[PDB]
Every structure is written in C-alpha cells, then in structure tokens.
Design a protein around this ligand. Structure first.
Ligand SMILES: CC(C)CN(C[C@@H](O)[C@H](Cc1ccccc1)NC(=O)O[C@H]1CO[C@H]2OCC[C@H]21)S(=O)(=O)c1ccc(N)cc1
Lengths: 99, 99
C-alpha cells in the first residue's frame, strides 16, 4: 500500500512463527527486534543508535513476513526500545519513499 | 521524487541559513538536527532511541527547506550523530512510504 506519515507506520510482522508489531523505519540501516526466542545460529554484535550502542544477537537469513510481504535476511535481536524494520528488509519488500 | 532504500535516504536541507544533509526518517516522530546555534526561544526535551536518551532543545515554528520543499515546524537540536527529518515534517512535504 501507500502509507502516509501522520501516524507511526506500524505493521504486523511474523517472525519465528510469532506475530509482533514493528515500525517501518527508513532511518534504520538494520532491522532490530526486541529480545525473543528465535530459531537459528547467531553471532554477537553491537549496534549504535541515537543514544549510544547496545549488544545484539545477529541472526542471518531469517524468514520474516512484513505486512503480508516475505523477506529473508538479517535480524538483530536485543534491547531496542521499538521493533524496527530497517532498510535491509524494506528493500526486499520493494519499499520506496515518495514525495 | 522517488527515493529507493539501497542507501541511506539523505537529502539536502536548509535550516537557520545553513545547508546540511539529513535522513528522511519514517521511524522518527520528530526532526532532530545536529548541534547548531539557532536563535529564538526553546524548551528542554529528552528523546530516546537505541542506546538511550539525548538532551535536546525544542524549537517551534522553525522554517526548513527539505529537498527543495518548504516546511515549518518543530525542530529538536542536540548531539545527534545524524540529522533526521521526522514525520512531523515528512507529512508537510507530502512524503509517503510505498510498497
Ligand atoms: C529507534 C527509532 C524508533 C527512533 N529513532 C529513529 C531511527 O530511524 C534511527 C535514526 C538514526 C540513524 C543513525 C544514527 C542514529 C539514529 N535509526 C536507528 O536507530 O537505526 C539503528 C538500526 O540500524 C542502524 O542504522 C542507523 C543506526 C542503527 S531515533 O533516532 O532514536 C529517534 C528518536 C526520537 C526522535 N524524535 C527522533 C529520532
């Protein structure tokens, strides 16, 4: 769809079989999801945002449904304030900004 | 214009008589600009993201040009690592996310 920005662009995702709410976030390079059990191997990594750096678990090649569209790619799991869908997966679902 | 998300969606803005590069950021409620010496009244604010919070100065009714489009609204000024155009101004320039 076309999504206007008067409200937060929140969508439902399915990850590891579980439904969650997530924010479509063009300012995020990477997708970052709150702490959860996720099947797959992972690697320790760190990422930085506006307020500093956090530790995350990097899971590669994770199958995730975003607003009914399929993506398969990297999901960082850790203590983010908000579940965020970043450009690595927005590009997979063909998302663009338009004005 | 259409902006794909392979790379960071950076555009040129003009604020307080200065040109800067800024992110078109659907994940930000508010616009946050790197420290600059803006004139006028402001109110203290703290905003949080990955890593924690930063202290910013909230300026209202600030005129800003974004990729050639005029806008006027609230701009938060503080030690952000990137200039961020948030939804408060993205709506004014008619920006949508589409997939
Ligand atoms: C976490 C979001 C809910 C909110 N943020 C906007 C978000 O787009 C930031 C915007 C952003 C961009 C770069 C640096 C800091 C913040 N991106 C971000 O944290 O992305 C992280 C995940 O991918 C990585 O790529 C960029 C940093 C990492 S935020 O910058 O913290 C923020 C919070 C409140 C306001 N008013 C404005 C911005």
């Amino acid at each position: 769809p076309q999504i206007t920005l008067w409200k937060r662009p929140l969508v439902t995702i399915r990850i590891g079989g579980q439904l969650k709410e997530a924010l479509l976030d063009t300012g995020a390079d990477d997708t970052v999801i709150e702490e959860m059990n996720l099947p797959g191997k992972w690697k320790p990594k760190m990422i930085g945002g506006i307020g500093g750096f956090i530790k995350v678990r990097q899971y590669d090649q994770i199958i995730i449904e975003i607003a009914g569209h399929k993506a398969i790619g990297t999901v960082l799991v850790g203590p983010t304030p908000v579940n965020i869908i970043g450009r690595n997966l927005l590009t997979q679902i063909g998302a663009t900004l338009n004005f």
